[PDB]
């Protein structure tokens, strides 16, 4: 048989404009998005924001890192802080679904 | 922009029969499959062998491990030895193309 043991991982490079990165997240320790699951997930992509304009990030993608900040097993508040603490240029590390 | 930084990784579980695993490999330190590339690649899947029957392994797949034996930066001869030294049950770790 065959089964995924880890996901394809993409690095998405964005330039943040006055409209911001324009995506929403859910999940994290203390805000689990599914039972037993601490991952950060992308839940909304806002029209006109950098993520939407670039076109690569997708709802349901798992956010593993922002810049040098690992988001693999962190609280929701820590992920939110990491996103807010971005400059003009942002590197996102995302896991894609394995289906 | 978006670009892959690492591949989806599959674990393929096979039962080796009298016909064997039935696949060929190329690459490794001292047998590089492309310039600057030390990876082990699957080059042939033999009709009727375990890999072909199971259907999941594909020509061009990158073989990262056989059982507990890492093949990430090894000689060609070391990869061949790792494959030959398999029992009935084999775990293959494979990277899939990111396209
Ligand atoms: N994938
Ligand atoms: N993939």
């Amino acid at each position: 048989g065959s089964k995924p043991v880890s996901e394809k991982i993409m690095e998405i490079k964005l330039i943040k404009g006055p409209k911001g990165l324009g995506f929403s997240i859910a999940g994290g320790v203390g805000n689990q998005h599914w039972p037993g699951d601490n991952s950060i997930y992308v839940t909304k992509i806002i029209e006109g924001g950098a993520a939407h304009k670039d076109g690569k990030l997708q709802i349901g993608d798992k956010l593993l890192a922002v810049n040098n900040v690992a988001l693999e097993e962190v609280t929701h508040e820590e992920a939110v802080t990491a996103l807010k603490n971005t400059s003009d240029f942002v590197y996102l590390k995302v896991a894609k679904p394995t289906s």
Side-chain angles (χ1 to χ4, degrees), chain A residues 7-8 96-99:
Chain A
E7 303 95 329
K8 180 174 57 177
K96 302 293 302 184
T98 43
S99 39

Side-chain angles (χ1 to χ4, degrees), chain A residues 20-56:
Chain A
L21 296 173
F23 69 90
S24 296
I25 51 156
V29 180
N31 187 56
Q32 292 190 320
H33 187 62
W34 294 110
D37 183 349
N38 295 304
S39 299
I40 309 293
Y41 290 93
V42 177
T43 56
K44 311 175 197 165
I45 303 291
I46 288 98
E47 178 217 320
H52 173 240
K53 287 198 155 205
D54 163 79
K56 304 302 176 265

